[PDB]
Structures are given as C-alpha cells and as structure tokens.
C-alpha cells in the first residue's frame, strides 16, 4: 500500500496551490464517523446475545 | 469559543481556530487503537 | 528533499490535511468492512 | 505555565488549536496589499 | 491529478503550512528591499 | 517564479509524510514582521511629510 492522499483541489491563484481539509473539516469528519461505528459495535455485541 | 482566557496566543484577526492536524492524528491514533480491540474481541467470538 | 522532524517539531510542524483525510478515510473503510463481515457471521 | 503550542486546548480529544492557513492567507492578503499601497505611493515621490 | 476547487471549497480547504511560509517570507523580503532602497534615497 | 515552501520536514513515520508550520506558528511570524514594516513605513512618510 501507498500512504493514501484525499480530498485536495486546486486553488485559481497557483501561488496557494493544492488546498486540503482543515482541522475543524477533519474534526467533524471524524465526530460523525465515530458514533454509528461506536453503536454498531455496541449492538452486534448484543445481538450476540440474543441470537 | 476561543477566548483570551482560554486561548493564550489567541488573535482573532487571523479567523476562527480549529484543531491542528497533529491533534487529528493524534485523536486518530487513539480511536482507531480503541476500536480495533472491541472489533477483535468479536471476531474472536464469531470466526 | 525536506530534512527529517525532530521530536520536537510535533504539534509545531505537522500533517498535510489530505495525508490525513486519506488515512481517515482507510481507518473507516476497515471499520465498516469488518463490522460487515462479522454481521455475515452472526448465522455463519 | 502552559507552552505556547499547547495554550488552546478546546476540545481536550483534540488538542491545543491554531488558526487555518486559509485565515493566515486572508490576513497576509489584506496585509500585503494594503503595505504594497503604501510603499508604492512612497515610491512614486520625486 | 486533483480537481481544481469551487468558491464554497475556501474555509474548509487551505493551502499547505509549508506554501504559507514560504510566501509570508517572500513577502517579507520584498517590503524589506523596497525599505531599504527608500531609505537609500531619502538618507544616502 | 515558482511557488516558494519553506519549513518542512519528514516526518519518522513515512505514512504522515511532509510536516509543515501550523497556522499557530505563521501567525507568530506574521504578527512579529507587521510591526517593525508597519512602522517603518510611517516612519517614512513623516520624513517625505516633514518637506
């Protein structure tokens, strides 16, 4: 595997180049896909249980 | 909010302020590492 | 041919936001995946 | 005493936070442009 | 190969530390020689 | 002229690549060369105001 590069696009002045997420864009990315897999895990575990 | 009491080089001229990318990495690091162990316990039970 | 980071330069110097959006994205995919293949086990 | 790359901690599983590098080019926009302005009025003094 | 970026992109996505230095520094030295040649003319 | 980058480096672990200054770091910079250039130039327009 190649260390993954994503989501870039180029800015119209050249001189700023390849512009990428920022924190706050990657925080909140990762908040929202924290919680369904945090849950999902929680209810297989239970689901586990109930079969 | 950041705020001079709680931001010490806060300089609102500059925007809004947002974790670094090493605090991404950082929390990254920590989640995936959480999340691995949990997903391994179940694979354990279910394969 | 940038020189290599010193110990010290984290959380002074640190990660392109697209590095990081791409390891992101590859932690999620494994997660999904995973928790995907253990749902298809639940009745083998 | 807290260091200078560690004063900001808003979000303690986050970390210590810093403007973007979109309000560092905002600023250094503005700042450029307005200090261009200046100096080439001053450069157009006989 | 990445796609050229859309007005509502800006704030969201930003350029890299690195190009930020490097034209804070340009910008520097520019202001810093213009400086200097006015004070050439004014005091030499 | 090409775009210019300065003050990177690489990272130990070859999958978080090239580190470069956080906006924290630039906006010391920044903050520390407007005074002296801001000053400077009123400097200069007082002596050319000053005939």
Known sequence: ?51 | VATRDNCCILDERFGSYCPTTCGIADFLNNYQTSVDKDLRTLEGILY | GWPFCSDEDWNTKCPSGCRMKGLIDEVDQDFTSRINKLRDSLFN
Chains 1, 6 share one sequence.
């Open chain 1, 1 to 51: 595997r190649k260390p993954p590069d994503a989501d870039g696009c180029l800015h119209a002045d050249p001189d700023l180049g390849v512009l990428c997420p920022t924190g706050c864009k990657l925080q909140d990315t990762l908040v929202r896909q924290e919680r369904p897999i945090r849950k999902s895990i929680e209810d297989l575990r239970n689901t586990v249980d109930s079969v």
